């Protein structure tokens, strides 16, 4: 799963994901709980090619996220405690409905 | 991607994911925003095999979630507006760090 025109991009080394503080309590908790689903390294082009930080960082952010997006994974890889708790509730309701579907039609 | 011992399980038809109301504002919003990452149909065994709803629903919930978990997808398939906003912020910080890594060592 390689995004187009990745040639001449280099993958840097892992780093620690920044801890960010958004105002909202939702964003803060969401970020803690989900930050591991995001990249911990970026793609970039050689410095000998840039005139400033801004351009460097434009290509790096764009391509890093595109590339991270095309990457395959299992749905289960992504889920968290929260997802898990939430599927158990909704999948239970749905199985009760399937049950009713089966009793009525049977 | 088939979980073991799926034989004799049947996949029911899609339904509308229930809308659930948890007390917490986090859970409620999280669920709206994420409910589409969860199944909209379940696996189950023939009714002629059960003595009650509870057993039917035990197998159905367990296997449906296991099976949903092993299912492949792209990381980008999973992301939402929120994930996207969040990656743009963290991937920007990281690209700034990679930048500093490159300026110092260069
Ligand atoms: Cl590096
Ligand atoms: Cl059905």
Q: Where are the alpha helices (DSSP H) in chain B?
A: 25-34, 53-70, 75-78, 81-104
**Residues forming beta bridges with residue A44, ordered by sequence position:** A10
Mapped onto helix, strand or coil, the DSSP state of residue A39 is: coil
Listed residue (A69, A77, A43) closest to B79, CA to CA: A69
Q: How far apart are CA B13 and CA A58, in angstroms?
A: 45
Q: Which two tokens stand for residue B17?
A: 């994911």
| Domain B1-106, CATH homologous superfamily name and number | Prion/Doppel protein, beta-ribbon domain (1.10.790.10)
**Interface mutation target, options A87, A97, A106, chain B, most CBs of B under 10 Å:** A87
Q: Which two tokens stand for residue B10?
A: 């049947």
Contact B36, A43 (CB under 8 A): no
Task: Please count the other Cβ atoms lying within 10 Å of the Cβ belonging to residue B69.
Answer: 19
Ligand 2 center from residue A74 Cα (angstroms): 26
Contact A89, B20 (CB under 8 A): yes
Listed residue (B78, B22, B31, B83) closest to A74, CA to CA: B78
The DSSP code for B68 is H
Q: From the DSSP assignment, how many helices (H) and strands (E) are in chain A?
A: 4, 3
Phi and psi of B48, rounded to 5°?
Answer: -55, 0
The DSSP code for A40 is S
Over its C-alpha atoms, chain B yields an Rg (Å, rounded) of 21
Phi and psi of B94, rounded to 5°?
Answer: -65, -30
Over its C-alpha atoms, chain A yields an Rg (Å, rounded) of 21
Question: Taking CB atoms and an 8 Å cutoff, what residues of chain A touch B30?
Answer: 26, 30, 82, 86
* Chain B CB within 8 Å of residue A32 CB: no
Ligand 2 center from residue B42 Cα (angstroms): 9
Select from B18, B47, B79 the Cβ nearest to the Cβ of A90: B18
Method: X-ray
Listed by number, the residues of chain B in 42-81 with a beta carbon closer than 8 Å to a beta carbon of chain A are: 42, 44, 47, 53, 56-57, 60-61, 64-65, 68-76, 78-79
Q: How far apart are CA A83 and CA A80, in angstroms?
A: 5
Give the angle A105-B5-B7 at the CA atoms, nearest 5°: 45
């Amino acid at each position: 799963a390689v995004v187009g025109g990745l040639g001449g991009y280099v993958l840097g080394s892992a780093m620690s994901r920044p801890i960010i503080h958004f105002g909202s309590d939702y964003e803060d908790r969401y970020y803690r709980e989900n930050m591991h689903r995001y990249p911990n390294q970026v793609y970039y082009r050689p410095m000998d090619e840039y005139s400033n930080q801004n351009n460097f960082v434009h290509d790096c952010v764009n391509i890093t996220i595109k590339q991270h997006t095309v990457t395959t994974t299992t749905k289960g890889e992504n889920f968290t405690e929260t997802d898990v708790k939430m599927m158990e509730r909704v999948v239970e309701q749905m199985c009760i409905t399937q049950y009713e579907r089966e009793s009525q039609a049977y």
